[PDB]
Design a protein around this nucleic acid. Structure first.
Ligand SMILES: [Ca+2]
Length: 341
DNA sequence: GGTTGGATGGTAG
DNA sequence: CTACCATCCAACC
């Protein structure tokens, strides 16, 4: 069981570097701009010179602007990076045909066939790294071990433009002195929830009862963490697929008014049908983030696929229903497409 | 255990 | 923020 996990360095902000190579060795800040008062939104990426002063993904742009007004701020042509991204997954493919893609900047090979050992994986890892740079000029950080986790952590280690191999030995020393924060899948909140309760490293979850675990952080992650602490996590490298496809866009203000919301709600359906391409969903869900931050889904499931027109007037009915149940003015809206054929 | 309800939170790029 | 998944009461074949 050998894994070859690849990961595209500060990807979005990195592609803007290669595109405009007069944008480099400098603070770059890829941004999703919301629309409201004189900028507003949140960071989706920043290169390392940016995020060495704190300007990291998901923080209000005004901070990014109040730590690095120096910086370069660029919008977020997610389409574009997608283009460039897909092209990489082809290269990752050539060298092993069990390519589990995850996020736009990430993917895993189960190369256990075109390697006899780990020495040879490093050599390959350099190959891939050398082919992705050559053809698209994008540095990426490979990571290698027994499993998609250890593979990922090893990348988390020498993260920017790097390559590491966690054999079995280092597999075991991590578990003891690897923090639950640094354990992929586990975002902070789970960690801080665990952090609070005396609970830091991953192995500590073996000195703790199970029902006092799914009674805080839940099963999937309860077991998931206990399995790697036991080490019995070496589960498969299988491709990923999309259930939902949505777009909740920010309105001009807060509106209890069928007509006010409509074009925003129709603009969503619109773009939602950009990203959907050839495919055809059975179910639809009209999302609403209110005045405050409540979230007010109502939805509908068919025994057929939906068609865009159908998708508009059904959306409204599903919106009408938000207004004789909610009474609070609504300040964000969108749609969602579950259940594909 | 399936399956369609909706409300929240957690994990990302 | 935008996007997507998981996650947990609630009905009910
Ligand atoms: Ca990544």
């Amino acid at each position: 069981g050998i894994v070859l996990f690849v990961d595209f360095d500060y990807f979005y902000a990195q592609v803007e570097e290669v595109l405009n190579p007069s944008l480099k060795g400098k603070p770059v800040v890829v941004c999703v701009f919301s629309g409201r008062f004189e900028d507003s939104g949140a960071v989706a990426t920043a290169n390392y010179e940016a995020r060495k002063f704190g300007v990291k993904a998901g923080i209000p742009i005004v901070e990014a602007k109040k730590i690095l007004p120096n910086a370069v701020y660029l919008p977020m042509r997610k389409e574009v990076y997608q283009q460039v991204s897909s092209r990489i997954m082809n290269l990752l493919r050539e060298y092993s045909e069990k390519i589990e893609i995850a996020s736009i900047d990430e993917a895993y090979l189960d190369i256990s066939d075109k390697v006899r050992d780990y020495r040879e994986a490093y050599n390959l890892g350099l190959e891939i790294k050398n082919k992705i740079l050559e053809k698209e000029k994008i540095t990426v950080t490979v990571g290698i071990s027994k499993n998609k986790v250890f593979a990922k952590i090893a990348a988390d280690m020498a993260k920017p433009n790097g390559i590491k191999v966690i054999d079995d030995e280092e597999v075991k020393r991590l578990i003891r002195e690897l923090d639950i924060a640094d354990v992929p899948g586990i975002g902070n909140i789970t960690a801080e929830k665990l952090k609070k309760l005396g609970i830091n490293k991953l192995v500590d979850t073996l000195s703790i009862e199970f029902d006092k675990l799914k009674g805080m952080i839940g099963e999937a992650k309860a077991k998931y963490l206990i399995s790697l602490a036991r080490d019995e996590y070496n589960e498969p490298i299988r491709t990923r697929v999309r259930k939902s496809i949505g777009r909740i866009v920010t309105m001009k203000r807060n509106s209890r008014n069928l007509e006010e919301i409509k074009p925003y709600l129709f603009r969503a359906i619109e773009e939602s049908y950009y990203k959907l391409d050839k495919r055809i969903p059975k179910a639809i869900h009209v999302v609403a983030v209110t005045e405050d931050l409540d979230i007010v889904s109502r939805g509908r499931t068919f025994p057929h696929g939906i068609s865009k027109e159908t998708a508009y007037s059904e959306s409204v009915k599903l919106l009408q229903k938000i207004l004789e149940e909610d009474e609070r003015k609504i300040r964000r809206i969108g749609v969602r497409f579950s259940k594909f054929i």
